[PDB]
mmCIF file of C-alpha atoms in Angstrom:
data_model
loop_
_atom_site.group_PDB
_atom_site.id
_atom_site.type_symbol
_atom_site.label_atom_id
_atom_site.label_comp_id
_atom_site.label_asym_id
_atom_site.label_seq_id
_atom_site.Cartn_x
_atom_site.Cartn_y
_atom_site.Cartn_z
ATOM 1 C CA UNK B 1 0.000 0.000 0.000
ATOM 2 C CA UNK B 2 1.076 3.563 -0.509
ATOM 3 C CA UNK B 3 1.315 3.719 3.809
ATOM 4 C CA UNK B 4 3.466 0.612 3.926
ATOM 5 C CA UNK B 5 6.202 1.953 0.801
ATOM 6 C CA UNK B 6 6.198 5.689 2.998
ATOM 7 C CA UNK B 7 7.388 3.122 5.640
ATOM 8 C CA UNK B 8 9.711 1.293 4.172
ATOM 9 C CA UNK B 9 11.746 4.101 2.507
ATOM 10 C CA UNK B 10 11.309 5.654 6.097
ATOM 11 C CA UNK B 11 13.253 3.293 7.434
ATOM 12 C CA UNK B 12 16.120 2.622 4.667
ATOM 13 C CA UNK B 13 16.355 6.509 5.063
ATOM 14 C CA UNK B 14 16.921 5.862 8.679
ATOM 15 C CA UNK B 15 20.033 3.393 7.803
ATOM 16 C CA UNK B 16 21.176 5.076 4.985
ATOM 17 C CA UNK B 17 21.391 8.263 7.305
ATOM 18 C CA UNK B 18 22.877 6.410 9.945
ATOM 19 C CA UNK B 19 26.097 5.434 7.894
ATOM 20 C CA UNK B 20 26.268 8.736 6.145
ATOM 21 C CA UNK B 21 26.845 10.551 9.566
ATOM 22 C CA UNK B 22 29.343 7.401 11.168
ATOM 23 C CA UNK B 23 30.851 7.810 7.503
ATOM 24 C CA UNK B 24 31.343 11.859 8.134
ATOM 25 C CA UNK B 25 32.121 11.847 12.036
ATOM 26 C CA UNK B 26 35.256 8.974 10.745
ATOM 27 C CA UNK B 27 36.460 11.191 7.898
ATOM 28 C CA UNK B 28 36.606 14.339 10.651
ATOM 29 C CA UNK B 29 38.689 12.157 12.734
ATOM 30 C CA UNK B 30 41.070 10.856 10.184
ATOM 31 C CA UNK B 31 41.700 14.558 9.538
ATOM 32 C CA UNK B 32 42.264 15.714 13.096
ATOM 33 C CA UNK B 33 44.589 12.993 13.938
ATOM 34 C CA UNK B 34 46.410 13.423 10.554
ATOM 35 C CA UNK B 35 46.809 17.289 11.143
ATOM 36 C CA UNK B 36 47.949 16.463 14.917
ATOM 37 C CA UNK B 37 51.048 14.289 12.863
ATOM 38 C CA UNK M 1 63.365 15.639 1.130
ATOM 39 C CA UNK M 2 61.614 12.244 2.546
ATOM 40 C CA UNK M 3 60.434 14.558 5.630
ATOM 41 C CA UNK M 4 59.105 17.353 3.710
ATOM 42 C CA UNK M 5 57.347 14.746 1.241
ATOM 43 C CA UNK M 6 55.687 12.925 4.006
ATOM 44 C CA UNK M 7 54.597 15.918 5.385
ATOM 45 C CA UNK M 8 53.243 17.037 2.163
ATOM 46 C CA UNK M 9 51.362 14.322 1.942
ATOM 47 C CA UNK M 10 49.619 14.962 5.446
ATOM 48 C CA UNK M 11 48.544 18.038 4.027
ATOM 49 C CA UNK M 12 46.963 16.699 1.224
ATOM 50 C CA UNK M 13 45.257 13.791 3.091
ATOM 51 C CA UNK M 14 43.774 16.732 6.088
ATOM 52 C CA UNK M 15 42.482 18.231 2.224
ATOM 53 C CA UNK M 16 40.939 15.252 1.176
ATOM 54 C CA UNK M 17 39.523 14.252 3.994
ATOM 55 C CA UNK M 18 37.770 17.666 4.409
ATOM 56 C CA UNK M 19 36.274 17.115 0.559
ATOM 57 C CA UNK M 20 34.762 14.098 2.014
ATOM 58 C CA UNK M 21 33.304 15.170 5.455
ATOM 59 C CA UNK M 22 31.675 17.821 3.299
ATOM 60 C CA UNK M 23 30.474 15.642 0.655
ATOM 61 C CA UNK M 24 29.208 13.510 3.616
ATOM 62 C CA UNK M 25 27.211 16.327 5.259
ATOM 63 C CA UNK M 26 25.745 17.650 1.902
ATOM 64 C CA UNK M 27 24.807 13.689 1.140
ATOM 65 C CA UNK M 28 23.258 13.567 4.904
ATOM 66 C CA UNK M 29 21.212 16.766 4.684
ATOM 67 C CA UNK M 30 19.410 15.913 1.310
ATOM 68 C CA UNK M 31 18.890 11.953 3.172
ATOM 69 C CA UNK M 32 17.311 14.092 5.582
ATOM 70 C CA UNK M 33 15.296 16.349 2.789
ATOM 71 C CA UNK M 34 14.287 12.947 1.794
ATOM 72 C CA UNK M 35 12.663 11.934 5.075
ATOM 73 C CA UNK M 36 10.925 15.521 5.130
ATOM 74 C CA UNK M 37 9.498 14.613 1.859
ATOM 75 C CA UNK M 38 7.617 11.201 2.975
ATOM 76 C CA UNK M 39 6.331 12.862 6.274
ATOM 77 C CA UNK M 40 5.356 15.846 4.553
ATOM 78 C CA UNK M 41 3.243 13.403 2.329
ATOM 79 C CA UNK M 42 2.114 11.323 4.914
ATOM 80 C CA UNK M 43 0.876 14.215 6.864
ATOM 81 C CA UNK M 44 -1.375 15.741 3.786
ATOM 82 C CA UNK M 45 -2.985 11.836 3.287
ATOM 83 C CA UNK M 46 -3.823 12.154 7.021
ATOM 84 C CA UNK M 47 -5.246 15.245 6.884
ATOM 85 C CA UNK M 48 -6.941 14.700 3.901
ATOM 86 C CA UNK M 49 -8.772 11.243 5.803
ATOM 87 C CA UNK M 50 -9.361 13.715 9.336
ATOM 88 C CA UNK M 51 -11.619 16.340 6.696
ATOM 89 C CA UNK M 52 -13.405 13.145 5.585
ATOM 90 C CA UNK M 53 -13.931 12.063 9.064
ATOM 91 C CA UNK M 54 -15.240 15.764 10.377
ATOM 92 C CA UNK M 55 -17.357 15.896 7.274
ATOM 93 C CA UNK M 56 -18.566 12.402 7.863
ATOM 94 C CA UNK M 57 -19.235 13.409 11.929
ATOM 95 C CA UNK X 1 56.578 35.224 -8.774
ATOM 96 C CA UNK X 2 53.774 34.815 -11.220
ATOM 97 C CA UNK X 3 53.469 30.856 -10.728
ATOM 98 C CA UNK X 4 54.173 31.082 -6.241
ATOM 99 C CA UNK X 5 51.435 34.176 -6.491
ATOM 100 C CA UNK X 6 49.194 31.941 -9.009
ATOM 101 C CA UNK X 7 49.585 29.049 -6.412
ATOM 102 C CA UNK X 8 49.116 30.894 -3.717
ATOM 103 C CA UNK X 9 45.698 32.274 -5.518
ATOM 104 C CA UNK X 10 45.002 28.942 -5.882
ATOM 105 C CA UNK X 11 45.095 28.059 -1.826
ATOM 106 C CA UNK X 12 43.268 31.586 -1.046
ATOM 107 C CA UNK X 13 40.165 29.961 -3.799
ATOM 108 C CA UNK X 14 40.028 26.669 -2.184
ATOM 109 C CA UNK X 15 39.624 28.249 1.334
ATOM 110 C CA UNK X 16 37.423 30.522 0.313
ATOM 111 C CA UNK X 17 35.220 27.767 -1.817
ATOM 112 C CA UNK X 18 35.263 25.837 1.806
ATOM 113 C CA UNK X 19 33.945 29.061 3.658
ATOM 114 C CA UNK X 20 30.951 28.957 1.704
ATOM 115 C CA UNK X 21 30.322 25.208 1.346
ATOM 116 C CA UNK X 22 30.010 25.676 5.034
ATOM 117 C CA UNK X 23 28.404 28.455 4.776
ATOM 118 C CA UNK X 24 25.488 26.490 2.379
ATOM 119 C CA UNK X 25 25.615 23.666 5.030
ATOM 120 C CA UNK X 26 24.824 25.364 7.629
ATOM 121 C CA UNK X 27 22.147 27.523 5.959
ATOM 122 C CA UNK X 28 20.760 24.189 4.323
ATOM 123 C CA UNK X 29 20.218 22.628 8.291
ATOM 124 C CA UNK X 30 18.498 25.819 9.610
ATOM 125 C CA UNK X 31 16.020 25.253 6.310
ATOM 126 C CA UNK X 32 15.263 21.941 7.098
ATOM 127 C CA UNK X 33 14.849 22.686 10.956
ATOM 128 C CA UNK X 34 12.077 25.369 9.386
ATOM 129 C CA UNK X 35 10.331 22.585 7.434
ATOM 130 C CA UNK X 36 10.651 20.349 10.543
ATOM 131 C CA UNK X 37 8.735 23.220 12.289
ATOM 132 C CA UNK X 38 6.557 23.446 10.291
ATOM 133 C CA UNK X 39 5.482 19.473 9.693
ATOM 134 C CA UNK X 40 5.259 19.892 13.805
ATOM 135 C CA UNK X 41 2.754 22.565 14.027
ATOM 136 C CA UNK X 42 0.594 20.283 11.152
ATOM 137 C CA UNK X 43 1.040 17.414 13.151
ATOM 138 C CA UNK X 44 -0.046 18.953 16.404
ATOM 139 C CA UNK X 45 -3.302 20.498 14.511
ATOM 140 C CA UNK X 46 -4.005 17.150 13.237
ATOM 141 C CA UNK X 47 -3.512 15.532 16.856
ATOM 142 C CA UNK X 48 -6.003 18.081 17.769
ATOM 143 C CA UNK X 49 -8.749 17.261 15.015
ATOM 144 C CA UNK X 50 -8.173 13.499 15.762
ATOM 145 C CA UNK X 51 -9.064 14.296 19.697
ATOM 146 C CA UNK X 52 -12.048 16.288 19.415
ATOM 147 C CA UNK X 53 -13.530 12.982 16.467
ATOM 148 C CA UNK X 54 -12.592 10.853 19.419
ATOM 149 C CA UNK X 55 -14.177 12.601 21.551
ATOM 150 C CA UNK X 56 -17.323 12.682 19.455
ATOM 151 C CA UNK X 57 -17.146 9.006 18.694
ATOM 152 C CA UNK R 1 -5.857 29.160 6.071
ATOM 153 C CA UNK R 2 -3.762 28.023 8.264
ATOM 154 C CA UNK R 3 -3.335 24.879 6.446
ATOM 155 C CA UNK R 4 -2.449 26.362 2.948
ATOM 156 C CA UNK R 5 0.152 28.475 4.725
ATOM 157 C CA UNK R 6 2.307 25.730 6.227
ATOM 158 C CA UNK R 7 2.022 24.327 2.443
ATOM 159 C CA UNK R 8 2.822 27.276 1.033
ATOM 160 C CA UNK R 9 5.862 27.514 3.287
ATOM 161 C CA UNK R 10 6.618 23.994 3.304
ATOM 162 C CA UNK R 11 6.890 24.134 -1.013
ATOM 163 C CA UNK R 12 8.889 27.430 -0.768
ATOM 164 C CA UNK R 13 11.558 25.669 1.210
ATOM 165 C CA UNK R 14 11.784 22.554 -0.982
ATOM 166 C CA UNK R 15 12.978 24.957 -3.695
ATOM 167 C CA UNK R 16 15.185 26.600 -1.462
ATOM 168 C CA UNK R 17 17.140 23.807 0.453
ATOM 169 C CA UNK R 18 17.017 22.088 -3.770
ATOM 170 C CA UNK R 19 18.886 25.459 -4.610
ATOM 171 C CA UNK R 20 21.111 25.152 -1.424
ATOM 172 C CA UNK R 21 22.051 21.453 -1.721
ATOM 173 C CA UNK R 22 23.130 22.663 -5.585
ATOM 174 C CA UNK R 23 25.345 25.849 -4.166
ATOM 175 C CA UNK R 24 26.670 23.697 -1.835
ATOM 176 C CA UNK R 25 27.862 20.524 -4.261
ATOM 177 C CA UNK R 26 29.160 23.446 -6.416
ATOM 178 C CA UNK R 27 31.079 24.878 -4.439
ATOM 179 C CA UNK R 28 32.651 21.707 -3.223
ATOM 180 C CA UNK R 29 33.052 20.909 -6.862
ATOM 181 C CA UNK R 30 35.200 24.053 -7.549
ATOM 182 C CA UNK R 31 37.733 23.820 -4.627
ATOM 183 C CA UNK R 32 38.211 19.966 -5.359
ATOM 184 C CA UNK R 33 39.063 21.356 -9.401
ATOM 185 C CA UNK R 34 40.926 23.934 -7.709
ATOM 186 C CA UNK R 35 42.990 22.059 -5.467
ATOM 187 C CA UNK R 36 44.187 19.466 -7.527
ATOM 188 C CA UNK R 37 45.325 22.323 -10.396
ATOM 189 C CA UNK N 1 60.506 34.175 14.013
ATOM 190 C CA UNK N 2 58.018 35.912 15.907
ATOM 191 C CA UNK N 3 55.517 36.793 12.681
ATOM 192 C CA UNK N 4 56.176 33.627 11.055
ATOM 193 C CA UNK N 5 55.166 31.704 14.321
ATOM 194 C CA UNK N 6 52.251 34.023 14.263
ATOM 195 C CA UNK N 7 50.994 33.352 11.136
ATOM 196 C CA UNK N 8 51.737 29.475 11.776
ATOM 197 C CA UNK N 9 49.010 29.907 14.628
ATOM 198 C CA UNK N 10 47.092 31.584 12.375
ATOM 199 C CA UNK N 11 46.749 28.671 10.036
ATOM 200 C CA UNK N 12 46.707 25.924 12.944
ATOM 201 C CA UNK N 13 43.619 28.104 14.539
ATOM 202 C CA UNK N 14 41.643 28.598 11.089
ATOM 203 C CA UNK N 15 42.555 24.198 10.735
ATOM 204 C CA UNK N 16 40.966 23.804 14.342
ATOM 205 C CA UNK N 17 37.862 26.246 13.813
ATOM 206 C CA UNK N 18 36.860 24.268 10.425
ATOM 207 C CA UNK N 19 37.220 20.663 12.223
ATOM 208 C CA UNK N 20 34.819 22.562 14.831
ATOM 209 C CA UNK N 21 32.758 23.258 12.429
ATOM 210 C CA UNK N 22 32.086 20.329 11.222
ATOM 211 C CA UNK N 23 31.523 18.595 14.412
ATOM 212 C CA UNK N 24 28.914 20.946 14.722
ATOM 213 C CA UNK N 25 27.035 20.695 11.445
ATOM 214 C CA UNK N 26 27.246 17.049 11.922
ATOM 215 C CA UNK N 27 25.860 17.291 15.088
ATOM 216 C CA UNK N 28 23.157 19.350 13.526
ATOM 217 C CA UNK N 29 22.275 16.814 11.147
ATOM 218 C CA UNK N 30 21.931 14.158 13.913
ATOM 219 C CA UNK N 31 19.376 16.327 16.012
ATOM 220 C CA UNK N 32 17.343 17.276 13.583
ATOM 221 C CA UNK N 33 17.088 13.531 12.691
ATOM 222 C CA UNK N 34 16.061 13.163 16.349
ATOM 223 C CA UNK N 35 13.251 15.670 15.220
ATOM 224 C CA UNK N 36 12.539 13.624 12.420
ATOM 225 C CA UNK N 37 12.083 9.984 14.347
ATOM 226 C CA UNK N 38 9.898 12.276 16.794
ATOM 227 C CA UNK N 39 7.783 13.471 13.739
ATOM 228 C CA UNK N 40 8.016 9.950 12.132
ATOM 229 C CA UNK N 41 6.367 8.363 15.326
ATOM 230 C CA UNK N 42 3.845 10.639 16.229
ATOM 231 C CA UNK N 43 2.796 10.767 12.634
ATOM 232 C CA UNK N 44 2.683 6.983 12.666
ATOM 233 C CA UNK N 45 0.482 7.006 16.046
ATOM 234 C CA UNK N 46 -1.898 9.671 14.220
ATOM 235 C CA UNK N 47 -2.737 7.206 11.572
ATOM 236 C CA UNK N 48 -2.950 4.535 14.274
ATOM 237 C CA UNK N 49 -6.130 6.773 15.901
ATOM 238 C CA UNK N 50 -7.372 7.478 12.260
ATOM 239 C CA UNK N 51 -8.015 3.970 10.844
ATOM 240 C CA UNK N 52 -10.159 3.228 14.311
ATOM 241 C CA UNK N 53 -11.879 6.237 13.365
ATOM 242 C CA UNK N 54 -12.516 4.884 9.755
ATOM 243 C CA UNK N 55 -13.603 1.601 11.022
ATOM 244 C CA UNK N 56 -15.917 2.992 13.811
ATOM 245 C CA UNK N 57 -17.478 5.515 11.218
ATOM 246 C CA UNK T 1 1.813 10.824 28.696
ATOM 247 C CA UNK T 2 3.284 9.522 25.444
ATOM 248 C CA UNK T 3 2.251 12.400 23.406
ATOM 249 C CA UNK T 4 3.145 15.153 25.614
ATOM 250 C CA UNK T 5 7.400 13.311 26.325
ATOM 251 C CA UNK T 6 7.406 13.773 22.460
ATOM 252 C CA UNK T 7 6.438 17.232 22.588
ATOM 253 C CA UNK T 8 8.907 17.752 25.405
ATOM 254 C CA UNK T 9 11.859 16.122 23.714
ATOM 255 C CA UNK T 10 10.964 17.741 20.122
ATOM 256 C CA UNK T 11 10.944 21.151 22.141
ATOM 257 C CA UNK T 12 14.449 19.893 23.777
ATOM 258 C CA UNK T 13 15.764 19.390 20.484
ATOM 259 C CA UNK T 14 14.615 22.931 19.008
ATOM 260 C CA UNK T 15 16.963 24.559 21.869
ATOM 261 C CA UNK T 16 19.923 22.281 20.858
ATOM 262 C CA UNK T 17 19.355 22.853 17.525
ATOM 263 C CA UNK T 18 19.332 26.986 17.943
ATOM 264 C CA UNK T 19 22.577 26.559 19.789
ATOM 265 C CA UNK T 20 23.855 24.243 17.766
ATOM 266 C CA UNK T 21 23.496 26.550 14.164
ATOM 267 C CA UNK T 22 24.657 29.561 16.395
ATOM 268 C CA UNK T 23 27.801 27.849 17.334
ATOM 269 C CA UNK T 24 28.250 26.643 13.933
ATOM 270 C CA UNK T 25 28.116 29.831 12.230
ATOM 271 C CA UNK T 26 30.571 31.754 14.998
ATOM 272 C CA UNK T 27 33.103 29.174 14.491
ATOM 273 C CA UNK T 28 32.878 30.036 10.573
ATOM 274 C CA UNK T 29 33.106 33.258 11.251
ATOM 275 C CA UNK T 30 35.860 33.641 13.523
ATOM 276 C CA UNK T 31 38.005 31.200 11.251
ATOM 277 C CA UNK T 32 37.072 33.128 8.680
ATOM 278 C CA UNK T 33 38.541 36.564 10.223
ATOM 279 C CA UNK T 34 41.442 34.811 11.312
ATOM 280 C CA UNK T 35 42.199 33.511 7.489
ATOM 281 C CA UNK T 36 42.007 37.356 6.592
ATOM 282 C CA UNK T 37 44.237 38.480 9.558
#
């Protein structure tokens, strides 16, 4: 049903979000700790 | 000029990484835009079924 | 020095270029906070509706 | 009304946050170019 | 070396103040997320309340 | 109630959110004078 699709890309939004922002917070360390060489 | 190399190389890795935090955060915030989308629509179906419901009452 | 000041340029454009991608970022989350504010006030005036047809059932 | 306000509002910010996320990847875009001239 | 340790700091403090600013843009992003889980539930408890409705009208 | 923690918490996050932009945008700034300094 249209409900249940609004749902489901709800909730791969919700993981895809997830990763994007562990993905970013990584990246921002690498580049403190490289600058800090 | 191993040193100066290496160092170098920091430099451009602190640059690169920055491309990609960036290209992170602009990826996150339209993921997010996303999300606003489906509750935005999901909000208007509801509201459109609660006019039914007063009309109905 | 045309090539160091050229290089130099160079650095000065990339900072500058981050400065503003920031500067979009930034400006792009307090847009999305307004649509969040404003999917919250439709939400509570739905809650609202959906009382009052409760209330009537 | 109050309801075709908040989707008045709501469509004028999907075009602006659509223009923003574009500024933004531009931006980006031009310092990456930049950099690596 | 007084100006060229200056401007060293310079460059070390502008480094710092972009990492801090994208800690906080990514922390940005993860509130208003928070928002958007809030939204995502309370629209999903709305609906809940409107398909008894339905059924009881 | 349940409704009324979510309001709460969504009202939480509006603060953290205000603070959160405002802090953003003063570290841009101030690295920002500093590049031109």
């Amino acid at each position: 049903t249209q409900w249940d699709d609004w749902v489901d890309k709800m909730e791969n939004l919700n993981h895809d979000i997830l990763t994007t922002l562990h993905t970013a917070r990584n990246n921002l360390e690498q580049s403190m700790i490289t600058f800090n060489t | 000029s191993t040193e100066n190399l290496y160092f170098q190389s920091n430099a451009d890795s602190v640059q690169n990484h920055t491309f990609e935090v960036e290209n992170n955060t602009i990826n996150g915030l339209e993921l997010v835009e996303e999300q606003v989308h489906i509750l935005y629509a999901m909000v208007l179906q509801t509201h459109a079924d609660v006019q039914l419901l007063k009309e109905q009452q």
